Amino acid sequence: PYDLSEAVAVVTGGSSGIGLATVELLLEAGAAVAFCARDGERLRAAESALRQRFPGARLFASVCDVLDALQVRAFAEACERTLGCASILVNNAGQGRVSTFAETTDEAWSEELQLKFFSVIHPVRAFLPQLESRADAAIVCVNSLLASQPEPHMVATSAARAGVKNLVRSMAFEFAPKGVRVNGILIGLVESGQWRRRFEADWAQWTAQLARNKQIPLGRLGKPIEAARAILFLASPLSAYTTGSHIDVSGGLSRHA
Amino acid sequence: PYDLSEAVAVVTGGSSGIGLATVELLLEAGAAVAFCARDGERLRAAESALRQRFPGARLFASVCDVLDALQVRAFAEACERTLGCASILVNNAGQGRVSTFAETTDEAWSEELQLKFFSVIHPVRAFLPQLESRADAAIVCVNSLLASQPEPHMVATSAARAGVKNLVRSMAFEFAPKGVRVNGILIGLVESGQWRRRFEAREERELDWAQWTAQLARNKQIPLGRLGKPIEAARAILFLASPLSAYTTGSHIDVSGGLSRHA
Amino acid sequence: DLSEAVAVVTGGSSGIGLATVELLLEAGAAVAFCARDGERLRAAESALRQRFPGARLFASVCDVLDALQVRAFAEACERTLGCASILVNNAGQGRVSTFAETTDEAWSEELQLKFFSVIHPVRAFLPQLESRADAAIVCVNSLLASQPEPHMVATSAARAGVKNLVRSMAFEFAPKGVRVNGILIGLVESGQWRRRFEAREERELDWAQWTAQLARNKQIPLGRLGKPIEAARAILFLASPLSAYTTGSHIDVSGGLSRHA
Amino acid sequence: YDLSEAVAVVTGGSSGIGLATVELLLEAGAAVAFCARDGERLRAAESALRQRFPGARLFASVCDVLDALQVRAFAEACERTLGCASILVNNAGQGRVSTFAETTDEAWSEELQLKFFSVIHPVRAFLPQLESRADAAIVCVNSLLASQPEPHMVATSAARAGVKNLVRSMAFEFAPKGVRVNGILIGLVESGQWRRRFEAREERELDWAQWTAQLARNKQIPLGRLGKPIEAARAILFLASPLSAYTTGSHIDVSGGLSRHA
Ligand SMILES: [Cl-]
Ligand SMILES: [Cl-]
Ligand SMILES: [Cl-]
């Protein structure tokens, strides 16, 4: 249904979860794909499985911490050298934080904002010149419903996310004259390492309880792949008239009309 | 997953514009599609063209007034009889209305309100028994950015469309336990009979369709610098109607080419 | 304060409507109000004249769903109190129903009541408002407009339409100096809540205690029901020159119910 | 507005909206403390205020709100001098003009730090006081940029959004201890910036009043003029006072009709 064989897609934080699910979806659409992450071994393992599942795959995997501008510049340039100028950028890297206002220190605030903001600023700034040389150029920033609907034990992440949402609109407006669309998704509760971590403190039942307590209308946790599909629609020419917007991937958690 | 071969999709107002492009994308995904519309001739013509393009397609088209409760109940009956119980429903908004507040009589207010609300309430109420008996059931209501960002010459339509946007959120929550997801799209300026007619009545005679629409898009400050295409709107609807949006309910997709100023 | 103002309050014989009239008279404004029940209209009228001696007060039976009545009410206000500078639209109730429970008739009824209770008085009173200084319209509304609730489907929808209409009127009327804003009430103390308290099973909590636990149970952060006077104070702010750079907006009077940032 | 029983703290109170807020609180009979970075600016302001309000209970101290210890000492000084604080108002430092392309990492960090800590520090320092008082309320001054960004205010818009989100979380968290929290969203308000821009205009023929009217039309402000600090101050006062006793986790629009959102 979606044919991205012409595309060169970059995914930051692509070695697991939503990022990996996104990379998988991209290879399947025949796109040349590049992904980065900090952990080299998980990165190469993921890389091997990908090449397995997708024999022809044009795939480039590189260690890179998006918090380091210098690393991001080098990653962008190595991407261009290996696959050509990027046409798609998915900023996924990120790690939520559990804290009330009372529990969040200045140090934790700074860390939270720096992570949520620069994991988007760095890759966008380093790859924009490649994006703006390509047709069907699109950026997708992964975000959470917290950005528009805060939760009590996610005070700092919710506020940082809000900033990043606002930034997506600004980037959409700024880049539109150069042909680059910019959107994001707002995930709800999605199965993750963290949620299996908590479980260890059947699984498909302890989660059902969680979704029931969390009042998720669809009555289950989200799947990484589902987040990936919204990303894919937004990254692809299927949404060519959509920019400066978000797709809700929360299972009906947004109380707002 | 854009393999909708086992889906039964219903599109109200599907003989033209966004409705028609949605039907095409549905047939193309292999779904069995039913659609209705008022103009019989328009409906028939679009029907035969669809069958040429999609040989072997399971397609049921019937003249229907969605504002008429009884007609809609009958059209739902024929749909289940003809294709089987619906799994997807797409309510394709009637039309807009150009009017400031000062220019909107009581009669125009009523007419606008009833159109936007009942064009959704009737099909939904009628097909709900069907949608709720299926798996992967979804409803998409076609709406406009006017719903959350009003425009001066579209006062009544914006207000009516806000109501429907709100109702979409309610239906999603209410139908959730039964497996039926409910979303909308929010179109911007999208090529249509209205813009086509507006281009016929234009003052700038020197300009052709291509030039006039670009001038219009610039004048409207559309960041993407052009009017939307019905197929683009149809594509967002297809995503929301399909299992690809399986964890998305009570929401909307923006199809306005960057017109929404809200963050 | 508002002694130079002519304030009209549609639906002003009880609840938030009456509370707004009370505040307006207190601010020293000439005040007009309408409602359907003449008996209650006049009882309210009679109490207010006592409470506010020498008050410039005009009260009249009017169904806001009837254009010609609203028109007659507007003409009468001008003859009696002079040209209107402030308009508060309050008329209308809430309807309890799921989507399933809501008939076509009920939908039509709700849409009619919510919309025309605003459209009619605004249209009838605009010419007065647009010849006055410091002219303002306030449309009473509910958080339901942006955050619908399950057993209030039809009302939530019509309220959202009216909310969107407030934005359009603000933008439309601003060249002629008329500001337009609304409020979004949460759970407010009504005779209907008094009803339930009276028949509590079979607690020893007084009104304030029972209402407090009810609020916790409805997860209102502020931990109690809203009082008509609190809605009225926001209306007063929005009606008055104190909010002269505020148009096309809403003030949240829900006690913290809005989940949206 | 009888706030004679109130003790109100205004960070950023030496000029603009902050000073208009300080004046309104004082007219309302409240004990008032404010802080600022420029000593000379703060002193001049403090002095003028005393001449205006003879006998006022007024404390003013230089303080960098980005410095947690200065803020802490300031909060100590406020309590010892005026008594426990019951009202806190956090005035937005200022806006930064640049596009995304124009914003360096450094600019991004200071912009985020400024907007976030200018709220985080005073809240955390004063909260123990606020929760000791009835009718306690916090107001955070913000901009419409938080929900409706503008192209030459990219970093500030995003930082404003973060802070608007935070206001919702703080109202929910502090609600149990009786402290309400809200903000305001200013549009274009007369200020040093605009006076500066007026001073460097092409059309010298236009004076201040004519120029801002034209500017207002150009910016498509429905009310057709720039706001005045006193207008922002009046909305902050409403939100700070018992008049808004059932309002928390919210914002009041003070943009003159610039919000396109219904
Ligand atoms: Cl998160
Ligand atoms: Cl209601
Ligand atoms: Cl600003």
Side-chain angles (χ1 to χ4, degrees), chain D residues 138-175:
Chain D
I138 306 183
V139 192
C140 296
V141 186
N142 204 329
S143 168
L144 182 57
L145 299 172
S147 49
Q148 186 177 270
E150 299 299 338
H152 288 92
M153 305 286 277
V154 176
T156 307
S157 291
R160 304 279 192 179
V163 169
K164 182 174 187 309
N165 180 286
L166 177 53
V167 167
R168 163 62 194 169
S169 297
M170 295 183 306
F172 183 97
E173 192 174 322
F174 311 156

Short mmCIF file of all heavy atoms in Angstrom, two decimals, chain D residues 138-175:
data_model
loop_
_atom_site.label_atom_id
_atom_site.label_comp_id
_atom_site.label_asym_id
_atom_site.label_seq_id
_atom_site.Cartn_x
_atom_site.Cartn_y
_atom_site.Cartn_z
N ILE D 138 -1.50 31.12 43.05
CA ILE D 138 -0.35 31.43 42.24
C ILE D 138 -0.83 31.82 40.84
O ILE D 138 -1.74 31.20 40.31
CB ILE D 138 0.56 30.20 42.11
CG1 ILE D 138 0.93 29.68 43.50
CG2 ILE D 138 1.79 30.53 41.30
CD1 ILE D 138 1.89 28.51 43.48
N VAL D 139 -0.25 32.86 40.27
CA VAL D 139 -0.53 33.20 38.88
C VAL D 139 0.80 33.23 38.15
O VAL D 139 1.76 33.83 38.63
CB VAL D 139 -1.22 34.57 38.74
CG1 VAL D 139 -1.75 34.75 37.32
CG2 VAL D 139 -2.36 34.72 39.76
N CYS D 140 0.88 32.54 37.02
CA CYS D 140 2.08 32.59 36.23
C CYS D 140 1.80 33.38 34.97
O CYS D 140 0.94 33.02 34.17
CB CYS D 140 2.58 31.17 35.89
SG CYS D 140 3.08 30.13 37.32
N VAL D 141 2.51 34.49 34.78
CA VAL D 141 2.31 35.27 33.57
C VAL D 141 2.89 34.53 32.35
O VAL D 141 4.04 34.10 32.37
CB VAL D 141 2.90 36.68 33.68
CG1 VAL D 141 2.53 37.48 32.44
CG2 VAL D 141 2.39 37.38 34.95
N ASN D 142 2.08 34.36 31.31
CA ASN D 142 2.54 33.66 30.12
C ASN D 142 2.06 34.41 28.88
O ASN D 142 1.45 35.49 29.00
CB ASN D 142 2.07 32.21 30.12
CG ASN D 142 2.94 31.32 29.27
OD1 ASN D 142 3.51 31.77 28.28
ND2 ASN D 142 3.07 30.05 29.65
N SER D 143 2.32 33.84 27.71
CA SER D 143 2.00 34.46 26.43
C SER D 143 1.14 33.53 25.55
O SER D 143 1.20 32.30 25.69
CB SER D 143 3.29 34.80 25.71
OG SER D 143 3.05 35.15 24.36
N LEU D 144 0.35 34.11 24.66
CA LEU D 144 -0.47 33.33 23.73
C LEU D 144 0.42 32.40 22.91
O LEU D 144 -0.03 31.36 22.44
CB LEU D 144 -1.29 34.23 22.81
CG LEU D 144 -2.24 33.53 21.82
CD1 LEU D 144 -3.23 32.64 22.55
CD2 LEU D 144 -3.00 34.53 20.92
N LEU D 145 1.70 32.77 22.77
CA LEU D 145 2.68 31.93 22.09
C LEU D 145 2.64 30.48 22.59
O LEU D 145 2.95 29.57 21.85
CB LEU D 145 4.10 32.50 22.25
CG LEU D 145 4.38 33.89 21.68
CD1 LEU D 145 5.77 34.38 22.09
CD2 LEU D 145 4.22 33.91 20.18
N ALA D 146 2.26 30.28 23.85
CA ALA D 146 2.24 28.94 24.44
C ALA D 146 1.29 27.98 23.73
O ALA D 146 1.51 26.78 23.74
CB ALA D 146 1.91 29.00 25.93
N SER D 147 0.23 28.51 23.13
CA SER D 147 -0.71 27.66 22.41
C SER D 147 -0.80 28.03 20.95
O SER D 147 -1.38 27.30 20.16
CB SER D 147 -2.10 27.67 23.07
OG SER D 147 -2.50 28.99 23.31
N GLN D 148 -0.22 29.16 20.57
CA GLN D 148 -0.32 29.63 19.20
C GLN D 148 0.98 30.33 18.83
O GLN D 148 1.08 31.55 18.89
CB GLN D 148 -1.50 30.61 19.05
CG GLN D 148 -1.77 31.04 17.62
CD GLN D 148 -2.98 31.94 17.50
OE1 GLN D 148 -4.13 31.48 17.30
NE2 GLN D 148 -2.75 33.25 17.59
N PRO D 149 1.99 29.55 18.46
CA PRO D 149 3.33 30.12 18.24
C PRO D 149 3.41 31.04 17.02
O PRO D 149 2.61 30.96 16.08
CB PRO D 149 4.20 28.88 18.03
CG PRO D 149 3.24 27.79 17.63
CD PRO D 149 2.02 28.07 18.44
N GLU D 150 4.40 31.93 17.06
CA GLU D 150 4.72 32.83 15.97
C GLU D 150 6.15 32.55 15.49
O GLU D 150 7.04 32.25 16.30
CB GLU D 150 4.62 34.28 16.44
CG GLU D 150 3.22 34.69 16.93
CD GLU D 150 2.17 34.56 15.84
OE1 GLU D 150 2.53 34.57 14.64
OE2 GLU D 150 0.97 34.46 16.18
N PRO D 151 6.39 32.71 14.18
CA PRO D 151 7.58 32.23 13.47
C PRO D 151 8.92 32.85 13.93
O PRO D 151 9.97 32.22 13.75
CB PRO D 151 7.31 32.63 12.01
CG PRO D 151 5.87 32.99 11.95
CD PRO D 151 5.51 33.50 13.31
N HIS D 152 8.90 34.04 14.51
CA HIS D 152 10.15 34.63 14.99
C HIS D 152 10.27 34.54 16.50
O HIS D 152 11.05 35.25 17.09
CB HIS D 152 10.30 36.08 14.52
CG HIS D 152 10.60 36.20 13.06
ND1 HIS D 152 9.61 36.35 12.11
CD2 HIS D 152 11.77 36.17 12.39
CE1 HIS D 152 10.16 36.41 10.91
NE2 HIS D 152 11.47 36.30 11.05
N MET D 153 9.46 33.67 17.10
CA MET D 153 9.50 33.44 18.55
C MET D 153 9.53 31.96 18.84
O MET D 153 8.85 31.49 19.77
CB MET D 153 8.26 34.05 19.20
CG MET D 153 8.07 35.52 18.88
SD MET D 153 9.27 36.47 19.82
CE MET D 153 8.43 36.61 21.39
N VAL D 154 10.32 31.21 18.07
CA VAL D 154 10.26 29.75 18.13
C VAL D 154 10.65 29.15 19.49
O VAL D 154 9.90 28.37 20.08
CB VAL D 154 11.06 29.08 16.98
CG1 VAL D 154 11.06 27.56 17.13
CG2 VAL D 154 10.47 29.48 15.59
N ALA D 155 11.82 29.52 20.00
CA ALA D 155 12.30 28.96 21.27
C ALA D 155 11.41 29.42 22.44
O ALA D 155 11.05 28.63 23.32
CB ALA D 155 13.78 29.36 21.50
N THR D 156 11.03 30.69 22.43
CA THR D 156 10.18 31.25 23.49
C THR D 156 8.79 30.61 23.46
O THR D 156 8.22 30.29 24.50
CB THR D 156 10.02 32.78 23.35
OG1 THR D 156 11.30 33.41 23.27
CG2 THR D 156 9.25 33.34 24.55
N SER D 157 8.25 30.43 22.25
CA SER D 157 6.93 29.78 22.11
C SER D 157 6.92 28.38 22.72
O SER D 157 6.01 28.02 23.47
CB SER D 157 6.51 29.70 20.65
OG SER D 157 6.23 31.00 20.16
N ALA D 158 7.94 27.59 22.39
CA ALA D 158 8.06 26.23 22.88
C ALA D 158 8.26 26.23 24.40
O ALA D 158 7.62 25.46 25.12
CB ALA D 158 9.21 25.52 22.18
N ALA D 159 9.13 27.11 24.90
CA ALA D 159 9.31 27.23 26.35
C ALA D 159 8.02 27.69 27.07
O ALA D 159 7.75 27.26 28.19
CB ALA D 159 10.49 28.14 26.68
N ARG D 160 7.23 28.56 26.43
CA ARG D 160 5.98 29.03 27.03
C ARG D 160 5.00 27.86 27.16
O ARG D 160 4.29 27.73 28.14
CB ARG D 160 5.34 30.11 26.18
CG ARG D 160 6.21 31.30 25.89
CD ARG D 160 6.21 32.23 27.04
NE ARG D 160 6.81 33.51 26.66
CZ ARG D 160 6.91 34.53 27.50
NH1 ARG D 160 6.48 34.41 28.74
NH2 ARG D 160 7.48 35.66 27.09
N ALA D 161 4.97 27.02 26.13
CA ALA D 161 4.12 25.84 26.11
C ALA D 161 4.42 24.92 27.29
O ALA D 161 3.51 24.47 28.00
CB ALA D 161 4.28 25.08 24.77
N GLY D 162 5.71 24.65 27.50
CA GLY D 162 6.14 23.82 28.60
C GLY D 162 5.60 24.35 29.91
O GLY D 162 5.05 23.58 30.72
N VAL D 163 5.73 25.66 30.10
CA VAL D 163 5.32 26.29 31.34
C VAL D 163 3.79 26.32 31.52
O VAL D 163 3.29 26.23 32.64
CB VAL D 163 5.91 27.73 31.48
CG1 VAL D 163 5.24 28.47 32.64
CG2 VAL D 163 7.42 27.67 31.66
N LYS D 164 3.07 26.45 30.41
CA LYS D 164 1.61 26.39 30.45
C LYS D 164 1.15 25.00 30.87
O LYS D 164 0.23 24.86 31.67
CB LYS D 164 1.03 26.75 29.09
CG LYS D 164 -0.49 26.77 29.03
CD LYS D 164 -0.96 27.27 27.67
CE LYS D 164 -2.47 27.45 27.66
NZ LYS D 164 -3.14 26.22 28.16
N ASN D 165 1.82 23.98 30.35
CA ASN D 165 1.56 22.61 30.77
C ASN D 165 1.83 22.43 32.28
O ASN D 165 1.05 21.81 32.99
CB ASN D 165 2.37 21.63 29.91
CG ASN D 165 2.16 20.16 30.29
OD1 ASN D 165 2.65 19.70 31.32
ND2 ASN D 165 1.48 19.42 29.44
N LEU D 166 2.92 23.03 32.75
CA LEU D 166 3.31 22.94 34.16
C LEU D 166 2.25 23.54 35.08
O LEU D 166 1.92 22.96 36.12
CB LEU D 166 4.67 23.61 34.38
CG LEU D 166 5.27 23.71 35.80
CD1 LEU D 166 5.33 22.36 36.51
CD2 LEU D 166 6.66 24.37 35.77
N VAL D 167 1.70 24.69 34.68
CA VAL D 167 0.62 25.33 35.45
C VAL D 167 -0.53 24.35 35.70
O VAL D 167 -1.02 24.24 36.83
CB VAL D 167 0.10 26.59 34.75
CG1 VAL D 167 -1.20 27.05 35.39
CG2 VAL D 167 1.16 27.69 34.80
N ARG D 168 -0.93 23.59 34.68
CA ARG D 168 -1.94 22.55 34.90
C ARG D 168 -1.51 21.50 35.95
O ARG D 168 -2.28 21.19 36.87
CB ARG D 168 -2.37 21.88 33.59
CG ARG D 168 -3.09 20.52 33.74
CD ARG D 168 -4.42 20.64 34.51
NE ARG D 168 -4.88 19.31 34.89
CZ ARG D 168 -5.88 19.06 35.73
NH1 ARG D 168 -6.56 20.06 36.31
NH2 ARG D 168 -6.19 17.81 36.01
N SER D 169 -0.30 20.97 35.83
CA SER D 169 0.19 20.01 36.82
C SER D 169 0.25 20.57 38.24
O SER D 169 -0.12 19.87 39.19
CB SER D 169 1.58 19.49 36.44
OG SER D 169 1.56 18.79 35.22
N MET D 170 0.73 21.80 38.39
CA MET D 170 0.80 22.44 39.73
C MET D 170 -0.58 22.68 40.36
O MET D 170 -0.76 22.47 41.56
CB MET D 170 1.62 23.75 39.69
CG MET D 170 3.10 23.55 39.34
SD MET D 170 4.11 25.07 39.39
CE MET D 170 3.16 26.14 38.30
N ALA D 171 -1.56 23.11 39.56
CA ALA D 171 -2.91 23.28 40.10
C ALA D 171 -3.44 21.94 40.59
O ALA D 171 -4.03 21.85 41.66
CB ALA D 171 -3.84 23.88 39.08
N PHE D 172 -3.22 20.87 39.82
CA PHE D 172 -3.70 19.57 40.26
C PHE D 172 -2.98 19.09 41.52
O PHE D 172 -3.61 18.56 42.44
CB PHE D 172 -3.59 18.51 39.17
CG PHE D 172 -4.14 17.19 39.58
CD1 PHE D 172 -5.44 16.82 39.24
CD2 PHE D 172 -3.40 16.33 40.38
CE1 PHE D 172 -5.96 15.62 39.66
CE2 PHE D 172 -3.92 15.12 40.80
CZ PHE D 172 -5.21 14.77 40.44
N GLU D 173 -1.67 19.29 41.57
CA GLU D 173 -0.87 18.84 42.71
C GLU D 173 -1.13 19.66 43.98
O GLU D 173 -1.30 19.11 45.07
CB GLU D 173 0.63 18.82 42.36
CG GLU D 173 1.53 18.10 43.38
CD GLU D 173 2.99 17.98 42.92
OE1 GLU D 173 3.23 17.76 41.72
OE2 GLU D 173 3.90 18.09 43.76
N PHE D 174 -1.17 20.99 43.86
CA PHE D 174 -1.32 21.83 45.04
C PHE D 174 -2.78 22.00 45.49
O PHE D 174 -3.04 22.48 46.61
CB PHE D 174 -0.67 23.21 44.84
CG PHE D 174 0.73 23.14 44.32
CD1 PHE D 174 1.28 24.21 43.62
CD2 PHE D 174 1.52 22.00 44.52
CE1 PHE D 174 2.58 24.15 43.13
CE2 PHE D 174 2.82 21.92 44.03
CZ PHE D 174 3.35 22.99 43.33
N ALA D 175 -3.74 21.62 44.65
CA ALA D 175 -5.16 21.77 45.00
C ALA D 175 -5.53 21.19 46.36
O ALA D 175 -6.36 21.77 47.07
CB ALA D 175 -6.07 21.18 43.91
#
